[PDB]
Design a protein around this ligand. Sequence first.
Ligand SMILES: O=C1O[C@H](CO)[C@H](O)[C@H](O)[C@H]1O
Ligand SMILES: [Mg+2]
Ligand SMILES: [Mg+2]
Ligand code: NA
Ligand code: NA
Ligand code: NA
Ligand code: NA
Ligand code: NA
Lengths: 1011, 204
Amino acid sequence: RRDWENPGVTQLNRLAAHPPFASWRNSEEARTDRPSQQLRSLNGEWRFAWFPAPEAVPESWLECDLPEADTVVVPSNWQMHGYDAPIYTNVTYPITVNPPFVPTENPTGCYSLTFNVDESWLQEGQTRIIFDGVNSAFHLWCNGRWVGYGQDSRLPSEFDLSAFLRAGENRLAVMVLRWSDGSYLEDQDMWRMSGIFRDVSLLHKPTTQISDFHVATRFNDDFSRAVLEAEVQMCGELRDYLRVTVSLWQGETQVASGTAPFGGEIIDERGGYADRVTLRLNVENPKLWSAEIPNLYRAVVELHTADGTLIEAEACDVGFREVRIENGLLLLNGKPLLIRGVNRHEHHPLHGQVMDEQTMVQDILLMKQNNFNAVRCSHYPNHPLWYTLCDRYGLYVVDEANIETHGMVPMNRLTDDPRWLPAMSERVTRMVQRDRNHPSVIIWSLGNESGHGANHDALYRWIKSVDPSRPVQYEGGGADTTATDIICPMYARVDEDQPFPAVPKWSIKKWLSLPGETRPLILCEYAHAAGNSLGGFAKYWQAFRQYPRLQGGFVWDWVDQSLIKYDENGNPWSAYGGDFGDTPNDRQFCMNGLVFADRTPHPALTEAKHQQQFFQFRLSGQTIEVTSEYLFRHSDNELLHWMVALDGKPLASGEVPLDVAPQGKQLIELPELPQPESAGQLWLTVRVVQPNATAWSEAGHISAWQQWRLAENLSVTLPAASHAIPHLTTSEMDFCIELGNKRWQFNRQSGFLSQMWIGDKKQLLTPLRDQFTRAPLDNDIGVSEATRIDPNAWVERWKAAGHYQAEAALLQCTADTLADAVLITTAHAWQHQGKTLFISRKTYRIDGSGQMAITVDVEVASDTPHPARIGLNCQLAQVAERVNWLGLGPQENYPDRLTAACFDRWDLPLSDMYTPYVFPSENGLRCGTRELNYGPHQWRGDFQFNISRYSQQQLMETSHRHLLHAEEGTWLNIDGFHMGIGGDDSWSPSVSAEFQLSAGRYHYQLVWCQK
Amino acid sequence: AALLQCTADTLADAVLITTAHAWQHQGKTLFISRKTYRIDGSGQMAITVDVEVASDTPHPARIGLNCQLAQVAERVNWLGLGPQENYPDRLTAACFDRWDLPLSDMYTPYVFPSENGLRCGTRELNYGPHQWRGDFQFNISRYSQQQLMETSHRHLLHAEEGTWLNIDGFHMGIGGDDSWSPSVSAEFQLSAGRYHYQLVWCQK
Ligand SMILES: O=C1O[C@H](CO)[C@H](O)[C@H](O)[C@H]1O
Ligand SMILES: [Mg+2]
Ligand SMILES: [Mg+2]
Ligand code: NA
Ligand code: NA
Ligand code: NA
Ligand code: NA
Ligand code: NA
């Protein structure tokens, strides 16, 4: 019947969806959430065999293990074991678009397991098997007998095996299909894999059982009083002696308990539900749940007899919180939320899409440590443990249905088709039935990029009807359709409108006030962190803080989707689209995370942490005003450390305890600061430190910081006259300046300083020349599809203008001797096919003190695309271990992404001055630098710089970081100016006007000398 | 202005004058101006100005040069934004072109006297035998900035001997969102800390 090519059949013999069950036969264990003997894991070693199509599977496999099969670990994606290649494609379906058909060559994975089952499980009750995740469709057999079928890769499929099992040894046989009609609803921009990638278990339930239960919590006006309501449903034979007891616990203290026989209130003309009962428990002064303080209670649902015999128990963590939209604002416990969130895919560099507790916890810790309080399940229901962790650690979750049909034309072709309503409804309804009891889930999502169809409006209302406790959102069709309670655009800009036809992305500030609009606005996706990105991030947060209805958003995204591969030497390297022979593919577009696949931070993470701080500061005189953005907690684990320094040198510091109420302010007056010893700029730096450790952080964790320029004393003291005078040696091909053991050689043909000698040691490997280009960042290249070549992308404009090909032409090179120095004057014109792109005029002044002052004045043709940078570069013959500088740091920072950086004296090993982006590009820059020290060299002025063993040329021509090779010496790039990196999105020019080098005329001056 | 440095150097085809000043008050150095005047064999004086402004002093109204020329001409010819008065935050209406107006039109008769008549984005200015080139803002009239701020009514102003010229590399916005509180937007305040501008003064 080829059930995998029929959207009308999404499952066969599958049991109803429901909340997590464990079937405890001991209440104490249900209360403490301890392991349950009635819930067995079948994870471990299984037998697996790969076939090109389901037609190639031998019938023998159904009742006997195939000798050709291997023993593999489950859960797992078979591509990760090497049976076939994982495919990375963004929008374009990996299969021919011809719904509901899939290729005849359909990779088939045949799993089998021989396991034991005790007669005690078969003599009484029900024994069911549970597959938390199978990609993307499968048929189940038990002891050679066909059991059922299932679809939807991100929700569990359960089947009753009570009639197929036998005492002793049993054998399962699962035929998993890579492609099915369900694949048409799973076109998310991520690796395309398959297999039994989530847990498999066996659950025993009594015949008379708790089949479902819903927990709700409503409050009075000030939340000082609450009522917990628990509806419980049963299956089996109804008896007058059956009872249901629901008890609520706060730690070891039982707070409330209620018992009642089955039989619900009258529903309609035919009566009520005799197989259901609702318990209502009163709770005074409940400890409220929030991401700030994840207070949790434990609800225990007991099914028992009047005489006191327990039949079974279920339970869940309960969080007392209310979520509602009122007067245009998303409120939590009556307070307007400010969503500091991020999108997070279930990705592991080695295991693929198999999630483990360790990785989940690591992500959560890093998230909260970096001031995030929310996560969006892009774009499907997550591993069940995820919700438990967000419940306990405290993170707001947007639970999203596994529905994305991005590759359709138009996007809503399937979702506006009633023939697909069934398949869609199951992805939404089964998600709600599974996760509705988790307090962490505060918003439901109908899926992602499936345009907007009538099926969306239908399912939108279904959720509103069955679960009024959570708002529903969906971005397809314009981000503001009738299928969403929240305006949730993706990559809508802060001030700039993008009037696309039919589905415009208005600037978020303008979106809010459109005629008749009243809903709150939270971007489901923004600040695309692909590579060297997050430029302009601060602009979003200034807006979020000023506009009440702009309530944040979810950064895209958390972690790069790179996979581990091994080279000839067997060493691991990070791969992306196309590295597995997968084609078509969208290359590096799968890496858009704030952290690398191994969870190592990208520089952008710190910019995020800074902007998302929960404490805001203002300086007036010597008074620091600290405002709290927390909505529920007082700052009872915060200490403010302040430090004043004169250009890096510490002059004074202290620490004051913070005691600010949520939404409150605290005034802190700094003691009279001693007068700076010399000239320079005083800088005030304050940091909020958490003295005590928490569930998500260690003692001494820094949660917020800010800097301010205080008094400055301009140096009016002119240096002493030098002893010796530099000597000029004019030759036909060179202008050589001599001063003691030092020598500067300027080539008269090129007009560039080609070499420097300190004694007999050459200082340069490459001449000091102007540079107006950079190894293009992901945002410069701007393609979300490898097949598309955007001529409007910055890199194409630069290439087309000849910026990368431009040749310097000497216009002038003269030398002059002054009273105490030698003045070299130069002028170069950079041209491309007759067009003069840039003109650089310089003067080099080498005085008796051995300093070479370099003054640069550049002209940029107003009609050529604004240059990526304006500076100089050279290859220093030396390679030192450290880099020391006075400026912004310690991490990499660009013009539109430097708010998190602080002005101070920084010292790091040379390696840290290079950011290992998987896709190489310009990186490691540090801005606002007044002094740079490397080996014997020292550069002064006001510039931006990067330094490493990789020339811009190699970075630009190398596709993977692991293929880079340390060049001889050290490449230095010092820019008087540098263009912004952008990032609002990575498929169109995103660098804001203020960060484009459009001034036409630029001036900067550097001083090069010996340290 | 406290003189920090004043030197002279003879080059191949030019004389170089280097200077450094520090404007202070109550022992506080407010600004520091470093310049070089390069007069070559063609009679052109290239002036390069680099100024430092203490970060803790209120941003200055302008960063430029001024002098009182002895000559009094009838016309003012310039290549820049015009023909009317325009300031950094009020120049969208002005157009770049060759403008030529009588001296009187370069003065805006506000009843209450103040800085007036500025014209921005000027690459060339001509007055009498003089010509200034670069990329500056300027106002030119028979009234000094001093007289303007000391005189309450326009009818009390008296033409001073010669002509007062104010060539600025940078000028603060004029604001106006209201007239009873600071209203000059941030992007129009001279807060860069270090400013650079150059001019070429010659005869025509
Ligand atoms: O709009 C989007 O942008 C991202 C680009 O990396 C990613 O494809 C998301 O899944 C999609 O919703
Ligand atoms: Mg089907
Ligand atoms: Mg997509
Ligand atoms: Na807001
Ligand atoms: Na992507
Ligand atoms: Na505190
Ligand atoms: Na590259
Ligand atoms: Na006046």
